[PDB]
Design a protein around this ligand. Structure first.
Ligand code: NA
Ligand code: NA
Ligand code: NA
Ligand code: NA
Lengths: 303, 302
């Protein structure tokens, strides 16, 4: 539950008919951001300010949205909304909010002509609230699918998941993940819980089929995705935030196979608190972020 | 003239009252893209697909826009226009165009509440045409200023510039640059031609003043030069990104200081996918640096 971290509110905007939507995490307390874009087919916005060699931005919120490249328009809708509310970096003649975002491809399910736009991004902001939020095929995970080796027709449903890992001294590391992965989802044992299926419904084991010569038949296979946020209540520097985001990808490799493929835009945002008394080594937080991300992946398909 | 390269069209959308705008370069011939974000304060979109470790995208156009972080909306206005025209990568159920973009901060001049949006992003695509295009305070350079050590009121006007460098065998390297730099602009002999000015006098020499202890008073100091370099040569993704990296050396020759904490300096680089012209990338990158430096001076000569 990402809202376990102080100052975080989560809001969904869902279109059940078109099978698309977006999800925003709003930070009522200033955060220290980081990012790691590992997929070879990612579409993001505002990520340059999330790197250690960039200045400290004023991140108002982070959004996970559907609609492929078109869906980033919902991020601008969040920016417009937050400026109206008086949030963002005070430049004197205006306030400049910042809403980094990453997308998943969900156009092959439902209505391909409906994507999150300025209005839908605003609706998610209006709905952002503390406490527990809904999981599953909601918000950014509404049109998510898992295991597309044989196309979306033989895939399993994806979704949005979340999980919290507790450490000592009140330290917490939480994750919220939208699973739209090309590969299969496995548990800690190794059994397939979601992925590419044969015509009758049995799981085909994507990786085993590719080793035998089965070719990628997904919509984006001609040119040559799992996105999420990991948050902790510890104080972090910019380097530590980006290192946390990098180590969190190890959790995706735990549950998803194959991962980081040429059709995946896998991206992990990471946040710490600017003002906080809790501190911990970055390798423990990064390992805890990997577990939280792995647990949130399974939560996305069991909810 | 960026349109010296095959298949490139350029369109401006200018609001002379609000002092903002945007410029798009449309690629009618398939291109190989690269990027180098060197500034510490950049706001961009769709740049991840421009790196060598990413798949080959279908770049429909590249935008240079004002409006600070808000102005990236104009890039999505261009995406909507291109999908209506039938351009973009075909997934069967739709076509997905791609318009990477970078912004400059121009809110402290003119109307701060007017920024490039979906509509003016679309208008810029409607104006795209081959041949020569206007330079100066037009399009993305409409509200550009140079030399903001003492704030925008003691600055010089910037703008949009362009230049073409010719090499052997019909090879061309062209650049189009929006100069909104924090530092001063100098010519090939070292004369200050644009930059921060004293309260009632000459150029202050920004670098010399900060060495003496003058503090940055720009609006973003509590926490830009963007452009495109293009060649008619065939390039791989690595060579395109290497061309963008070397092009920044031309920016360093013209502007000082450069790549500061208030600059979002970004260079896009393109080569042709189908072309029989080839050349060493380090030579093309050096010509790209020269073209970028000449384009900086062109922006203030108009
Ligand atoms: Na959909
Ligand atoms: Na995807
Ligand atoms: Na302006
Ligand atoms: Na700027």
């Amino acid at each position: 539950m990402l809202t376990d971290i102080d100052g975080i509110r989560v809001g969904h905007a869902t279109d059940a008919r078109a099978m698309t939507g977006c999800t925003i995490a709003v930070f009522d307390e200033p955060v220290v951001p980081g990012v790691d874009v590992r997929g070879a087919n990612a579409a993001t916005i505002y990520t340059d300010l999330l790197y250690p060699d960039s200045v400290m931005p004023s991140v108002t919120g982070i959004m996970l949205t559907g609609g492929s490249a078109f869906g980033l328009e919902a991020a601008l809708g969040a920016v417009r909304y937050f400026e109206e509310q008086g949030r963002g970096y005070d430049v004197g003649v205006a306030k400049i909010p910042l809403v980094p975002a990453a997308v998943i491809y969900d156009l092959s399910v439902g209505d391909a002509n409906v994507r999150p736009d300025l209005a839908m991004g605003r609706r998610a902001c209006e709905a952002a609230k503390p406490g527990p939020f809904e999981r599953g095929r909601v918000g950014g995970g509404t049109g998510a699918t898992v295991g597309k080796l044989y196309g979306v027709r033989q895939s399993s449903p994806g979704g949005l998941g979340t999980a919290t890992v507790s450490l000592y001294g009140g330290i917490k590391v939480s994750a919220m993940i939208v699973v739209n992965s090309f590969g299969d989802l496995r548990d800690t044992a190794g059994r397939i819980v979601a992925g590419a299926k044969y015509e009758g419904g049995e799981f085909a084991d994507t990786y085993a089929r590719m080793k035998l010569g089965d070719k990628n038949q997904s919509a984006l296979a001609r040119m040559g995705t799992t996105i999420g946020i990991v948050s902790t209540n510890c104080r972090l520097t910019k380097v530590e935030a980006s290192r946390m985001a990098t180590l969190a990808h190890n959790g995706l490799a735990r549950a998803i196979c194959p991962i980081h493929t040429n059709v995946d835009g896998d991206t992990i945002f990471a946040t710490g608190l600017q003002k906080s008394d809790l501190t911990a080594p970055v390798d423990l937080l990064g390992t805890a972020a990997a577990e939280a991300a792995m647990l949130a992946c399974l939560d996305a398909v069991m909810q």
